[PDB]
Design a protein around this ligand. Structure first.
Ligand SMILES: CCCCCCCCCCO[C@@H]1O[C@@H](CO)[C@@H](O[C@@H]2O[C@@H](CO)[C@@H](O)[C@@H](O)[C@@H]2O)[C@H](O)[C@H]1O
Ligand SMILES: CCCCCCCCCCO[C@@H]1O[C@H](CO)[C@@H](O[C@@H]2O[C@H](CO)[C@H](O)[C@@H](O)[C@@H]2O)[C@H](O)[C@H]1O
Ligand SMILES: CCCCCCCCCCO[C@@H]1O[C@H](CO)[C@@H](O[C@H]2O[C@@H](CO)[C@@H](O)[C@H](O)[C@@H]2O)[C@H](O)[C@H]1O
Ligand SMILES: CCCCCCCCCCO[C@@H]1O[C@H](CO)[C@@H](O[C@H]2O[C@@H](CO)[C@@H](O)[C@H](O)[C@@H]2O)[C@H](O)[C@H]1O
Ligand SMILES: CCCCCCCCCCO[C@@H]1O[C@H](CO)[C@@H](O[C@H]2O[C@@H](CO)[C@@H](O)[C@H](O)[C@@H]2O)[C@H](O)[C@H]1O
Ligand SMILES: CCCCCCCCCCO[C@@H]1O[C@H](CO)[C@@H](O[C@H]2O[C@H](CO)[C@@H](O)[C@H](O)[C@H]2O)[C@H](O)[C@H]1O
Ligand SMILES: CCCCCCCCCCO[C@@H]1O[C@H](CO)[C@@H](O[C@H]2O[C@H](CO)[C@@H](O)[C@H](O)[C@H]2O)[C@H](O)[C@H]1O
Ligand SMILES: CCCCCCCCCCO[C@@H]1O[C@H](CO)[C@H](O[C@@H]2O[C@@H](CO)[C@@H](O)[C@@H](O)[C@@H]2O)[C@H](O)[C@H]1O
Ligand SMILES: CCCCCCCCCCO[C@H]1O[C@@H](CO)[C@@H](O[C@@H]2O[C@@H](CO)[C@@H](O)[C@H](O)[C@@H]2O)[C@H](O)[C@H]1O
Ligand SMILES: [K+]
Ligand SMILES: [K+]
Ligand SMILES: [Mg+2]
Ligand SMILES: [Mg+2]
Ligand SMILES: [Mg+2]
Ligand SMILES: [Mg+2]
Ligand SMILES: [Mg+2]
Ligand SMILES: [Mg+2]
Ligand SMILES: [Mg+2]
Ligand SMILES: [Mg+2]
Ligand SMILES: [Mg+2]
Ligand SMILES: [Mg+2]
Lengths: 740, 740
């Protein structure tokens, strides 16, 4: 009937867990504030701090500019939501029959047009705040982990990891607390209409990912224009070290890590968290939980996320307190232990939550029919996504860490030049999709079979249930990356850079793992939302063999390529400009190459700024307008096909791009470290094998930091966007077919 | 109702047009034989003959080796077809009610098993003959083109182009004649059972493309191992000309153009032709034409291809006798006009065919129901295919020719090194898919809407109705390529090479165009075959939102990545071996770098022979086993998703890979030619820009010549295979769902 945990217990447990997470983030920041520096050894400390500030200012300054354009576009788009959703019942103010049950009376559509607009703006704001907080902690932790590197890898690891945990706990706890509050606020207006309530709440996911789209693309173009320009002139052309202060692009580069890899990705992951919770809420709201107004069972997804914060806090302790890194080969294994521990504990967590927060039987909406489901089946839906995630992590590690043969062979292929390096790296990323796809399909089959779109949605959330940790291991990498850049720029000892290099290479693997979790969960939520879209738009069958569905399927499968085209070329063009800028400085400013004059950092910052702010617009436009263009002109059947093809096609290029790029970076890192004889035989730095590895690395740079990771957003965003506009498309869409 | 053209009329016309095409081919071969050479200056002549022989022997010898393996694979698979099909009705010899008309009696399913094996074997034999005859004309024409280049570019054009026409007309005529014969012979047995007759005839395409898959993959690995090795060591490492006779890999490189770009391609296109005709014939056989035994209308696709041959003969005369080339900038436009003229004349021919060979009204089988279709709508189905082809040609030219800005900016990006060449070449490929996809989507919509799977099929066929000319402009390219390999190897003057380079650049564009036609028609026929499969397998609805279909969709979308991983890895590995060997000869054979010692060519030929014969197998296994493993294990609904997914997904990567490869080749060719201030400034040969262009080109080599082009075969071959095995999967498959 109803569950062991009462509605009130749930109303308390969720925000408590949120505050536990925020508290624990604040505590970790406090620990990290113990490492001291300012700009007012000791000369070294002053240099770190001066470098931290330059970076800190650059990141702040670009986010402010980027957030200004995105906030304006957000406001415009919120108006389209209001207008389009408001037009379904001609802006009437009267109630009408429930979309989900014509025998009942529901709040007016116009109202849901307003609360959708509201949840949208909430999600956009929470997304910018996610990116921004992430950027604040990263640009605060970077120099601190550099200084801690003076004491050994282990101490630097620890401060990079605590700081990632600050980012992970703040975003997980925050995205959860804001949703919970918005649900409770909305419920005041909605009453017994839970359908209209969680329909309205859907705009939150749409707000998260809409903003994430620009954050990832804008940041991604800023950082990679710099990265490529810096590394090419400096390492390939001039034979100076990576991240050398004579290099005019290096500040842009390191600012880059913070505005892309940190702020773009914090947004992106908030988008994933939000869409997944929303997808689950929407199907539950017209299932037994929502129809019977059972609030615990209804908020099962938030209860899972709540218990996930607890599990991740416990998990974090293993890497920060219970264990110490003494040898570099211990870094990658430690990060991985974080995944294994959280997954195991979280399986326990989800079982307890399922025992306590669900009745043993209930029904789940299934394309018009109430399907009988058991709490043990729903446990299995969350679990399969949770384990699918771990699988994806293990395979990604295998294909991107330089501790294994796929990356070692890519490095090796450098002996025959850049061409063979690239060909091997491309083959590696292609090859890498196989198992993650099987994992995704298995977890689709199981969750779909057990609980239809609800099953699939909470399998997406299961995959993201350990997101505080996931964000911790990922945020850890750009912090480490900056740390080594500050070392080189501070003039510090050769062996400080060796330590940070080793943290950094582990970070490379870890970034590829986050992209995997983001692609796996995007595939799952997007499928759940596609199905919810189909119901909400009153389509009886999405029949692949009809002209409308098929042209949607093939065109939708083209979109990820069109998107990749724009974003690769933006980076290509901007990087070309950056190389010319860097060259100009080295060739023209007397004493630059000799270390006696200062480079002009601001000109490189500007090339990145201009290119990104300008070139983020078409890809953003492509993704946000496609559902509106196709929904209005062609209709819901054709958009159905678009969503299916973009999902299935988009994930392939997304996985292969990220793993290719990750593999070229770590192959280059392998040569740079010379930690085995095979690795030493490709060296030293500046060797022909090394330069071939650098060429691969910088082709990989836009693949994995601009186009690849954003593709997961192209897919999940079109999908929520379609669902939110479903009533409008069902009613007023399909124009070309109405006319002729 | 009868057409204006009687049945007997049709029976005469088709073989007559076949013969006319064979005669035209022979006449052209004869004209080309007027160019004299023998191995028994006049020193240039002797030398060209010797080299011509070394290529010819290497090409004959590789194909005999490949074709042996492939022929053994073919007999084995033929047994499998017989057993699997024969097992559906437990090998019974009794007649059964016709599934298309329960009042009639039809031939035993065992008969259809037997005849499917027979058509398969014809198709395989014809595909190997197609490739072999292609290689024989190319390895005859190549040196004759070198010699004619002594008189000028236009003379060398005429010889290469007459020689492509040899291949085009032989392949188109012979494929048409064999189909026509097989239909008449099977009819002797089937009599009035046209359903059985044409169900059995479908083996022909399956044998066509099974043989092609190995030919393309085998030939492709062979050629690119050689090419990457020769080019990287000779041009990038040792600063010697391309095709320098000092390079041990150059014989293997030039044999490679004949064994991949010619023999692999010829078989590939033959399978396109065979599948498209077969798909139109299966649907018509249970539509009014087949149910009413109306021979002319039944053979409408063959009549279309017969008229296509006449149209192409006419079109060929424009490039062969009526215009002459006197300047390098006229080569590409002459080649473009061949497609414009054939398209414009075939529009008229197809209008005529549609007027005389169809009743004005009839019905087409459509998912169990006879749909009313008029002959003018059928005209449009064929015509949208034809016109979508030309759109694809124009767009592909725009993206791959160095007369235009996309490639010139790709060459331009060399100014900043190999990493920017590759980022730009990658973005260009991705970008290039937009319009071809839109054209394919429009042809699907039009032909689907008018005439279901039949209209789609004859749309595939319409795109291929000008195949004799399509093959001629394509085959023209490798012949031209060899021509310049032979020029350099014969130590001919720089002027001869400049001419061949102009011919060869245009061949690069024309190869990309051919690939665009192969991919276009593959998408179309695969959709037609996918729909026909669904009927044969008794599926009521392929519904995307079912666990079975959806897991097939996403796994299907992954197959083209797994295939690309294997083929790219193979070329990479064989290339790496090739570089090692070339390096060793330059570094240890005293006098080789100075021209006083002969290299060892055979070793390079060996490395590429062993690699290709061994590595062709797994990718061939993956394509041919997937329908069997999926149909038997998961069943016909899952296989449906696999077909839809592989089609929509594989078409994106196939187009981008090919156009990217083509763009890198021509960006390089543009630095090589220095025909304008911008081009000159990237040179000269041996410059860092030039070497960056070479790096991009060699990375493009496996993309465009091994994995990219074979991908159309993956798609179209899984589709005809699933159809042939449909009755078997429908009865004995879905094991995993039966046991649980
Ligand atoms: C619908 C659900 C179906 C359930 C069953 C699916 C699970 C089976 C996985 C098959 O995939 C394989 O995975 C890799 C294993 O990691 C590859 O091996 C490879 O083996 C090595 C051999 O040295 C290396 O070459 C590596 O690249 C690579 O791991 C292998 O090619 C690939 O096909
Ligand atoms: C559905 C698709 C069909 C799947 C069925 C698989 C059939 C297995 C065939 C076994 O024979 C193959 O052939 C070559 C020799 O027999 C081997 O390498 C070869 O080994 C020899 C050299 O010793 C050759 O002469 C070389 O050309 C070549 O590289 C190759 O590894 C081996 O696999
Ligand atoms: C059915 C689905 C339909 C959904 C419709 C979606 C509309 C999305 C608009 C995308 O258009 C892009 O924008 C740039 C125009 O701003 C183009 O030119 C260029 O723009 C330049 C900036 O002026 C440069 O950045 C580039 O080199 C680029 O080539 C680029 O070609 C084009 O693709
Ligand atoms: C050989 C390897 C092929 C691999 C395929 C594996 C699948 C196994 C399917 C076997 O099919 C059955 O075989 C019997 C015959 O062997 C049939 O009996 C039928 O056979 C007839 C005699 O031929 C009659 O006596 C009866 O109608 C009788 O029901 C029966 O219908 C049929 O379904
Ligand atoms: C899906 C249905 C959509 C229908 C759209 C129609 C598709 C056809 C697009 C083909 O692309 C065009 O081709 C021209 C070549 O024919 C180029 O012109 C070029 O023509 C040359 C020579 O005639 C040059 O001199 C010029 O630079 C000139 O830009 C042109 O730029 C290019 O974009
Ligand atoms: C990667 C895909 C995994 C494929 C694995 C196939 C294993 C077979 C499990 C069969 O599943 C069945 O499906 C039914 C619905 O038809 C359920 O209702 C039933 O309870 C379940 O037993
Ligand atoms: C690329 C997409 C182009 C969109 C163009 C819109 C044209 C509208 C035509 C809609 O289709 C119609 O529908 C019926 C079957 O539904 C047919 O019977 C009819 O004959 C057909 O005309
Ligand atoms: C969805 C249904 C699918 C069912 C059909 C699947 C059957 C065909 C897959 C064949 O397996 C492949 O085998 C190769 C070799 O056997 C490769 O591994 C290889 O392993 C080594 C040994 O051969 C080397 O060749 C390596 O370079 C290479 O990675 C390759 O990656 C692997 O995938
Ligand atoms: C309660 C929250 C759960 C979280 C705890 C985690 C452990 C449970 C997962 C294992 O799944 C099992 O559950 C049983 C059920 O408990 C089984 O039989 C079930 O048992 C009966 C009802 O409980 C039957 O009527 C059904 O048909 C059904 O097959 C089912 O086969 C089995 O694989
Ligand atoms: K990183
Ligand atoms: K060519
Ligand atoms: Mg870098
Ligand atoms: Mg970085
Ligand atoms: Mg860095
Ligand atoms: Mg990195
Ligand atoms: Mg980088
Ligand atoms: Mg070459
Ligand atoms: Mg060649
Ligand atoms: Mg050549
Ligand atoms: Mg070429
Ligand atoms: Mg080449």
């Amino acid at each position: 009937g109803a569950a062991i945990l009462p509605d009130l217990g749930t109303e308390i447990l969720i925000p408590v867990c949120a505050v536990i997470g925020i508290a624990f983030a604040l505590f970790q920041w406090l620990l990290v504030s113990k490492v001291k520096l300012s700009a007012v050894d000791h000369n070294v400390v002053v240099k770190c701090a001066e470098i931290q500030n330059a970076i800190s200012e650059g990141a702040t300054s670009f986010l402010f500019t980027e957030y200004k354009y995105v906030g304006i576009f957000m406001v415009a788009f919120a108006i389209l939501i209001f207008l389009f959703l408001g037009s379904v019942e001609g802006f009437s103010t009267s109630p009408q029959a429930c979309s989900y049950d014509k025998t009942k009376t529901c709040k007016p559509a116009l109202a849901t047009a307003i609360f959708s607009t509201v949840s949208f703006l909430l999600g956009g704001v929470t997304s910018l705040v996610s990116g921004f907080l992430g950027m604040k902690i990263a640009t605060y932790a970077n120099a601190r982990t550099t200084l801690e590197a003076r004491k050994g890898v282990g101490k630097a690891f620890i401060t990079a990891f605590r700081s990632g945990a600050v980012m992970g706990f703040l975003l997980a706890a925050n995205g959860l607390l804001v949703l919970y509050i918005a649900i409770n606020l909305f419920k005041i207006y909605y009453g017994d209409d839970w359908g209209g309530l969680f329909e309205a709440i859907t705009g939150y996911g749409l707000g998260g990912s809409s903003m994430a789209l620009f954050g990832r693309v804008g940041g991604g173009i800023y950082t990679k224009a710099a990265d490529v320009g810096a590394d090419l002139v400096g390492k390939v052309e001039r034979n100076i070290p990576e991240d050398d202060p004579r290099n005019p692009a290096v500040i842009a580069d390191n600012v880059g890590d913070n505005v892309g890899d940190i702020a773009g990705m914090g947004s992106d992951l908030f988008g994933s968290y939000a869409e997944s919770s929303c997808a689950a809420l929407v199907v539950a709201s017209i299932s037994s939980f929502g129809l019977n107004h059972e609030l615990t069972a209804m908020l099962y997804p938030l209860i899972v996320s709540s218990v996930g914060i607890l599990v991740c806090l416990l998990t974090t302790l293993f890497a920060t307190d219970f264990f110490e890194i003494k040898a570099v080969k211990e870094i990658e294994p430690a990060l991985k232990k974080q995944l294994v521990i959280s997954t195991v504990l979280m399986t326990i967590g989800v079982a307890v939550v399922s025992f306590v927060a669900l009745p043993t039987s209930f029904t789940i909406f299934n394309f018009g029919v109430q399907k009988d489901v058991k709490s043990w089946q729903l446990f299995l839906c969350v679990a399969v996504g949770l384990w699918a995630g771990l699988i994806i992590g293990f395979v990604t590690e295998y294909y991107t860490s330089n501790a294994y043969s796929p990356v070692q062979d890519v490095a090796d292929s450098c002996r025959t030049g850049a061409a063979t390096n690239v060909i091997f790296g491309l083959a590696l990323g292609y090859k890498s999709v196989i198992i993650p796809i099987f994992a995704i399909a298995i977890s689709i089959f199981v969750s779909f079979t057990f609980a239809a779109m609800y099953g699939i949605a909470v399998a997406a959330l299961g995959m993201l249930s350990t997101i505080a940790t996931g964000l911790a291991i990922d945020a850890y990498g750009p912090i480490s990356d900056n740390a080594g850049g500050i070392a080189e720029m501070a003039g510090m000892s050769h062996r400080i850079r060796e330590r940070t290099d080793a943290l950094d290479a582990a970070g490379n693997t870890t970034a590829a793992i986050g992209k995997g979790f983001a692609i796996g969960s995007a595939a799952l939520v997007s499928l759940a939302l596609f199905g919810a879209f189909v119901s909400r738009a009153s389509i009886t069958t999405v029949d692949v063999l009809t002209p409308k569905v098929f042209i949607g399927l093939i065109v939708g499968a083209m979109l990820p390529y069109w998107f990749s085209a724009m974003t690769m070329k933006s980076v290509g063009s901007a990087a070309l400009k950056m190389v010319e800028e860097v060259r100009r400085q080295f060739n023209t400013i007397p004493g630059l190459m000799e270390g006696t004059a200062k480079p002009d950092y601001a000109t490189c910052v500007k090339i990145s700024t201009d290119a990104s702010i300008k070139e983020m617009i078409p890809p953003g436009a492509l993704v946000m307008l496609t559902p509106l263009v196709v929904g209005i002109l062609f209709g819901v059947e054709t958009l159905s096909g678009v969503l299916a093809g973009s999902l299935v096609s988009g994930v392939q290029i997304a996985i292969s791009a990220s793993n290719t790029g990750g593999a070229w970076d770590n192959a280059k890192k392998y040569i740079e470290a010379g930690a085995s004889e095979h690795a030493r035989s490709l060296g030293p730095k500046g060797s022909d094998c090394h330069k071939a590895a650098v060429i691969g690395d910088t082709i990989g740079d836009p693949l994995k930091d601009t186009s690849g990771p954003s593709l997961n957003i192209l897919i999940k965003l079109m999908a929520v966007e379609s669902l939110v506009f479903a009533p409008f498309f069902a009613t007023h869409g399909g124009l070309l077919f109405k006319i002729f």
